[model samples]
Target: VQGWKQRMAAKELARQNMDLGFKLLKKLAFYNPGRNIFLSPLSISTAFSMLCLGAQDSTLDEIKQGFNFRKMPEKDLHEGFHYIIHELTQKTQDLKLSIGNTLFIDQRLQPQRKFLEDAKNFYSAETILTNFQNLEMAQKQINDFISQKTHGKINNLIENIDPGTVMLLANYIFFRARWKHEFDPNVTKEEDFFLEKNSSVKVPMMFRSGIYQVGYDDKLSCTILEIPYQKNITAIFILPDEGKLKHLEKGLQVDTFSRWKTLLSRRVVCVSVPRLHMTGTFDLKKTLSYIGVSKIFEEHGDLTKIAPHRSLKVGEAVHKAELKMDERGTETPLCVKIDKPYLLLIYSEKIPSVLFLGKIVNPIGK
Candidate 1:
């Protein structure tokens, strides 16, 4: 119920249609967990929405207005979320069209007379996707599409997809932003990282000197850093002392995020933390079910809420996600520069792609 509430909050701000569309995109990205999952969702959502909206009576002017990505004020996170949703939808659609690709819908997208009126009746979006077939082929196509788009650095994602697995629905999102201040490769060295008490691993430590939102929680005895994305959106990362990663995760929640945001104070952190690039994927069916969205696959569920005259049942809902957080600044940092690239990555269900792509220049470093 909490997850539903959070999801609903995110949607209300995006307006109804955009919220539905974004949720779908997030599922799609979940199918591939090794790459930048967040970025994939952002890219695909933008592409898909743009194509669908453009094909309708909406003119370029209206379409542009619909998908604008302007930043929303801090007080209006919902509005900001909506702005991102529309912009991403349009961009995703345009990209698919530009590449001469057809956007396939799993029967659920099929329109019926007064289809919009039937959306509420369907209640379950997956039930309306009975037309999915050739899942293996679809997976490969998606892989090839992304690989080509990202210049071949991202490949093999599709090859790993299971064909028999029917995607009742999919959603994905990606955010690939270089740290405001990159790590100095020169100073990076194997340093001790605490996995747990009495257990430790020597990992490469990347250091950087720059202005960042930093704070030391005396209560938790941990250091927190807030990395701002374009337009002030932020991803917060917490580094616990030697062996307390688990503690941090246990304490992390939506409220923790809110508190971190409020407590963010500008400071010059002499960061010498381990350079980590982790990717994790989760099957939301379990997570969602755990969170009380069981109606999606239940006998009483109704997907016609999305469209009428649709009997498609969600055969499967798989989610894959990847994250790449490196210690590279978009622009060269002043004091220390990357001496040797250090990377860290983690995946929930599948192996991840290369973490430390070649030094900014050689790009896809194997």
Candidate 2:
């Protein structure tokens, strides 16, 4: 009973952290309205948590607050992450989901032994020493590791490296899965997708009819639907009423999301969704600073615990994520028509994580 309670507590903390991270990402999304937005909060948080293992004093406090770790004990925090990382890396035949973290340190610097061991043991992050003097080679090495981890879907993530850099952290998340109810390729036809009330673009919209878990939120003026994938992963689609996209976005909250889930019930509907292939790379330094993690980027950054012998600070934190969807499935469906702009969230059932969150405006536009 005690073990079960601890597990539940950790799960709740994970959910709280995920909610905080999503809101932070949503704020960034506000600046890019009308454009597609994609990100994995789990990926960014995991990388930062690994970095947090190297922080001390005020620096650690800021990171903990930024990630909503205030209520958790230091020991529980790292152990919680270890539990999550170990569970996520389990082999599964139906899903190809891989997440990786790495620390690229200048050859002239040596990190503390405790920090290195804790990062490796808890986060499964690999630390590599590289010659920062050779900027070209170091950049290539980091980019190549990212590419190999993501199976080449993402390459050249780091275009340039600073010769003065002491340490760099990177995170990558890649997910690929077939739909549980595949759409008929023959039924996929070119259709009009509205960019705005006055503009439209043609896209390959796929069609399927089946019973899906769905709900209608009168508060946000949006329709919510859940689409399952193989195993325990699923995608949630949110289609707001005409011209209410911004309103729905503004009202996004964990409470609202939970309510939507409770309101959802299996119903027959004709569904029309577009085939999506989107990739995004975020300069997380700016976003992280905007969300109360500014101190670590400054010159007085106190990462002394990371490398007691060297003056070290984070030079860059870049994240790259990609998602692909199409009409490949093995089951049949009922009826649902998704003929307009909508928001999509791809997540795993076993974890309190959002693997991919996106807003589709003009699917044919870059």
Candidate 3:
């Protein structure tokens, strides 16, 4: 029974990480309200992979047409990610998945080879740093890989990627279109903005008076806006009144977020906010330890269940993200909207800004 409890606990830990991953991605995406960002589907993929890795079975149970998990010991994180990748690539041949480190699938995972190979076509952090001997090359290779994968939706590559860093994880997604109602870039200008604490800063603000899902929260002293992305997902932003930003951040417990979401009013708001570009990076190894994943890196880490003597330690889980939200209304409105085919990968940092990055439009410039 104790063993079962531990297994359940591990699953729970991975699950929380998954949710956090999505939230972190959301935060990054919202930092700049109107650009594109692609999250690594691997957020879910990794969680699933770890599930399998933590389990004690060699055989994976096929869950559905596109999902599978290991039945024994517990769940199969490895096969789960592998299967999801297979399904995604099989249907959308253009997509890809790569790893900075070696991603060895157990021999049994070979059945999904066709998809795995397709995923390899796109650079994964695993493939980029395969040799790992040359740190500089690894960094350049990862930047180049991201450029190639994103097709330039995300730029300033050399600035964001660092390979030798303990945990350098990244994800990219891209889509293109003019806004539903384009903004005039000519009108875009730096403006004085009110912040949470009666203080203010000069910010590039995007202006568009349109009907959007808007709400006010007196309890939280904030406003919420819901922006949809492709695939029925959305980018939700909670903007605190001037000088109140710190309070919002300070009060940002799960319950606080839940209340903010619940209080959103479906009304048209005069949405004029900053068009800022932001980048975030952070690490989360210690946070994982705090959450009881202590066994993963030590002699007691017990990955033996994954396979005899797997000895897999997460050297580090680092991440970098870039986003730009602009209202220069030169392009069409679709270019600024998320209304078509797209995928969403969410992340919450185990530690601040360490685990993920996000933005509305794809980081790669199309």
Q: Which scores greater on lDDT, model 1 or model 2?
A: 2
TM-score of each: 0.53, 0.92, 0.54
Give the better candidate number (1 or 2) by TM-score: 2
Candidate order by TM-score, decreasing, is 2, 3, 1
TM-score of 1: 0.53
> How does each model score on lDDT?
0.37, 0.77, 0.39
lDDT of 3 by residue, 123-215 (tens): 222312233445566556656766666566544344432343322334333323123345566655666543323444565556665556556
Best model per TM-score: 2
Q: How many collisions per candidate?
A: 61, 12, 71
Q: Write the per-residue lDDT of candidate 1 for residues 1-366, one digit (tens) a residue.
A: 534433443443334322322343334334432233222223222332322221222222232334432233222333333333433222331121111112234553654433333221221111223334766666666656545654443444433433433334443333344443456678877776443355555667666666777665554445666554332234444555544433543453434544654766777665655554443233444534322343343322243433343343333443333335555554522222222222111111111111111111111221
- Which candidate leads in lDDT? 2
Tens-digit lDDT string for candidate 2 (1-366): 544544654576568655865686578768777677777777777788888888877777888898787887877777777766776664454667767788888887777788889999988888889778888889988888778766787787887666678777777777777788778999999988777776877889898787889888999999998999876778998999999988998888888878899889988778888888877778878878657886665555478767754356788778877777888665544455566778888866776667777777766555
- Candidate 1 Cα errors over 4 Å, as ranges: 1-81, 86-135, 145-167, 228-231, 241-247, 261-264, 299-301, 305-311, 330-366
